[PDB]
Design a protein around this nucleic acid. Structure first.
Lengths: 167, 65, 53, 141, 83, 240
RNA sequence: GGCGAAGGCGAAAACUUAGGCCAUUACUGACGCUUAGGCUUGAAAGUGUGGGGAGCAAAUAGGAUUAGAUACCCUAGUAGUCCACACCGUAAACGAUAGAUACUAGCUGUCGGGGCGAUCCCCUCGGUAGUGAAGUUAACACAUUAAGUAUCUCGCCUGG
């Protein structure tokens, strides 16, 4: 199925040769292909592994047989041209949706209001707004109604009343 | 706290969101609990798994520098 | 910590950094029951919670 | 007029009705609803005619094939319930059968007993007049 | 999710069914075969074992009730295929 | 009229987000300000019926005591009632072992009388520390039980401005079966007393007109001023 | 805080699988409860086999208080350990509480979704600590997150 792969190439090396060897490593996927030729540019490893003070970052997004990415996890991680093969799919805690996209107006609103950049408004980033209307769209309702009204007798004033005039 | 809970996506993944990671991660390369990060509970596990991957990914060190 | 050159500021943070390192090393420098091994952290969190809500 | 969370099919209507009545007596509830049951309709009607029961109404949803029945457990306007307690003689696992010769009074004769004898439900006292026995379902007062 | 839309829509017991006895038991047996293959491939999976026992016994009591409940609405899947 | 809506503008209101549904027939749902608000017409009718009942029973001229200090303004109002229309009162309330048994309070009033009579002679002639001690005993009298000076019996009606603030005044009175009038605010049943009043006094603008209308509903019996029964007189003031 | 048949679940990643939760105005026509019998796993310690043993480690060897220090103190130190096959079957496996059905005030909050709605506040349903009235009780105290009320079955106890 859908597969995004974050690549960790070995040590410090040229960008293009690493791109080519990462393509060769993606070839280890039997049919998980349709890659878009792109990369994340240069990003160094924040800590030396034992002599690797830096590396290069590449992203490969494509789709294919889900069973046939385990062999990639073997080959990329074993062969000394990829160190980490990070895979994205549903087994990792998922939340994606192809129809929840119409919520990026909230994205613009939060980018505006993650920190209030105007002197007039300096509200905390964790304070309410309250245009509230309380939409539900999920109730599990049943429309029970009365059709036969027998024995007219109801209980509405069920609060006690006692102890009349006392001397 | 995370922008993801403020937009609506119900999941995150390591798309090099390191900036917000630095808000959740102390300069000591250790993951602060849910209190500091500010996620509710779901984006909390999302950023937890992302930080653990970054540890594996060498995006963030375990402790070694 | 990793850096310390301030006269009076960084030492107080270094104190809690050392406390955190001790708490993190007091679960794998010596083998024990995982019960108390996690109970120490849970009790520390609980004590830090109720003192300041 | 359902209370909330419409009642599903219990192991037996009388047990669910008993739970509803005990909860109404305990947690200050007045009108309670139960699953559709002809015997429930009959017992509610006879309790109404007995004077210990308030209004009872059959209820239908968007459709008419399914049904339920609600009723106000008779409360006076001074927070007192007309029904103070119930007991079941016949049980789903043991339907005790008591012929006409086995119809005594209700704990002094003050209470009311109910039998499912031949068709519908009859009070043990009036069942003794028609020399009718049967399986006694409940004692109430 | 092995099968969710295959057997309950391609097979109609009555005029129309979205969930019934025999469509459910057919899907249940399809998942039974899938899970048996899975546990043969990986022998240390016991949650599947308990789920399979629950599924097959629920199918058995489904058929038992449908014996009297309907005249004949069960003679399409009362058997097992694992030999 | 009585219990008029000119008296109910912010009378309703209570603690934020803490309430039990034992209050069933008088409290309305609240989630806007979390301060539990209440319906008003039912309060008007109930308070008018209560006024009729209290005037009918006060035509017999029964003893009544003022015990409520939910807020400072309640104390000020009960002081006003005591200085205008009173027959007996207590400063704060019964402290326990004093209501269901008035022996401890009959001896209290007798000892107050005898202490005044005895201290009329103490003129700083034996020990100045001791006369300060006697003045301090008087001070403790006003604090704990300075109100019990003219009540020679058990009152037929006992005002309770809050069931959670009048623990002794409710419990000991309920040990016996004297009529008791109480409020019910946020976390109790409205059926713990004879006549039902779901009114409240925690709100700054409530207890003023509440206490005035309660006082002028009985003050007419003793041929004493009555200025909040059907008059347009009303107050809009904060608690003080 | 959630997912959890129990036992539990956290360096990650993924194949697969399972359980869900919310909502479906829906279908077989209630097609399900417990469990004789049968099936399954089972924390952990340890065992034969083959391999490994990095590390500590009983038993303890030696040593320190000691009236004794055999328990508690320190070092040396192997069985043990560890990987898989086969055997493990118990735990203070508990919720000191086997379940399933149906029903029953609330609240501070919060979690998963349906969510209007920067996030929100705010809820709908299930869950997650407490709460206190009915109810419950030998008391502990529980209470709609019952030790509450009724329906059906397996396990047990009749003083030590």
């Amino acid at each position: 199925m859908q597969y995004n792969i974050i690549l960790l190439v070995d040590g410090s090396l040229s960008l293009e040769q690493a791109n080519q060897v990462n393509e060769k490593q993606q070839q280890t996927l039997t049919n998980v292909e349709g890659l878009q030729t792109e990369y994340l540019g240069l990003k160094e490893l924040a800590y030396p592994i034992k002599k690797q003070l830096s590396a290069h970052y590449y992203r490969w997004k494509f789709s294919g047989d889900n069973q046939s990415t385990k062999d990639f996890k073997r080959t990329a991680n074993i062969n000394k041209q990829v160190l980490r093969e990070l895979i994205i799919n549903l087994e990792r805690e998922y939340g994606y949706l192809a129809s929840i996209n119409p919520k990026k107006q909230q994205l613009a609103l939060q980018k505006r209001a993650k920190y209030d950049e105007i002197i007039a408004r300096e509200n905390n980033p964790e304070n309410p707004d309250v245009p509230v209307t309380s939409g539900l769209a999920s109730t599990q309702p049943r429309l029970s109604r009365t059709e036969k009204a027998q024995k007219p007798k109801e209980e509405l004033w069920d609060v006690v009343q006692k102890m009349g005039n006392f001397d | 706290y995370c922008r993801f809970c403020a937009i609506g996506q119900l999941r995150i993944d390591l798309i090099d969101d390191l900036e917000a990671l630095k808000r959740f991660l102390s300069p000591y390369a250790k993951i602060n609990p849910r209190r500091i990060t500010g996620n509710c509970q779901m984006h909390q596990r999302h950023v937890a798994k992302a930080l653990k991957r970054a540890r594996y990914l060498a995006l963030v060190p375990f402790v070694k520098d | 910590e990793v850096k310390n050159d301030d006269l009076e500021l960084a030492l107080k943070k270094f104190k809690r950094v050392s406390l955190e390192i001790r708490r993190l090393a007091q679960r794998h420098e010596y083998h024990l029951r995982k019960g108390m091994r996690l109970r120490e952290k849970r009790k520390i969190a609980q004590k830090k919670r109720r003192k300041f809500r | 007029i359902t209370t909330t969370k419409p009642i599903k099919a219990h192991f037996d209507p009388v047990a669910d009705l008993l739970t509803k009545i005990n909860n109404a007596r305990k947690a200050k509830l007045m009108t309670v609803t139960t699953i559709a049951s002809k015997l429930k309709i009959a017992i509610l009607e006879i309790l109404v005619k007995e004077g210990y029961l308030a209004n009872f109404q059959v209820l239908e949803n968007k459709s008419k094939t399914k049904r339920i029945v609600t009723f106000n457990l008779k409360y006076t306007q001074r927070r007192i319930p007309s029904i103070n307690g119930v007991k079941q003689i016949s049980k789903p696992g043991l339907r005790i059968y008591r012929p006409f010769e086995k119809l005594p009074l209700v704990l002094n004769g003050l209470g009311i007993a109910i039998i499912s004898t031949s068709d519908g439900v009859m009070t043990d006292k009036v069942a003794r007049l028609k020399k009718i026995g049967g399986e006694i379902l409940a004692y109430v007062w | 999710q092995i099968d969710k839309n295959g057997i309950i829509k391609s097979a109609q017991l009555h005029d129309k069914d979205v969930g019934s006895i025999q469509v459910q038991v057919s899907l249940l047996t399809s998942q039974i075969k899938q899970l048996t293959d899975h546990l043969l491939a990986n022998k240390k999976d016991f949650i599947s074992k308990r789920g399979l026992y629950a599924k097959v016994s629920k199918r058995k009591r489904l058929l038992k009730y449908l014996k009297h409940n309907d005249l004949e609405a069960y003679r399409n899947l009362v058997k097992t295929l694992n030999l | 009229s009585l219990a008029k809506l000119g008296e109910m503008r912010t009378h309703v209101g209570m603690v934020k987000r803490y309430w039990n549904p034992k209050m069933g027939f008088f409290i309305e749902p609240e989630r806007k300000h979390n301060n539990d608000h209440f319906v008003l017409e039912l309060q008007r009718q109930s308070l008018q019926t209560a006024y009729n009942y209290v005037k009918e029973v006060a035509q017999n001229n029964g003893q009544i005591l003022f015990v409520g200090t939910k807020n400072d303004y309640v104390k000020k109002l009960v002081n006003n009632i005591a200085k205008r229309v009173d027959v007996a009162f207590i400063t704060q309330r019964w402290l326990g072992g004093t209501l269901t048994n008035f022996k401890t309070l009959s001896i209290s009033i007798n000892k107050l009388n005898k202490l005044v009579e005895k201290q009329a002679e103490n003129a700083a002639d034996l020990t100045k520390k001791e006369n300060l001690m006697l003045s301090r005993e008087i001070e403790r009298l006003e604090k704990f039980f300075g109100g019990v000076k003219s009540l020679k019996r058990l009152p037929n009606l006992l005002i309770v401005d809050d069931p959670v603030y009048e623990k002794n005044a409710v419990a000991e009175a309920n040990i016996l079966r004297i009529p008791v009038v109480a409020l019910c605010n946020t976390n109790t049943n409205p059926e713990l007393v004879d006549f039902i009043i779901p009114a409240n006094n925690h709100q700054p603008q409530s207890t003023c007109l509440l206490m005035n209308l309660l006082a002028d509903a009985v003050a007419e019996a003793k041929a004493m001023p009555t200025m909040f029964a059907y008059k347009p007189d009303e107050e809009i003031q904060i608690e003080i």
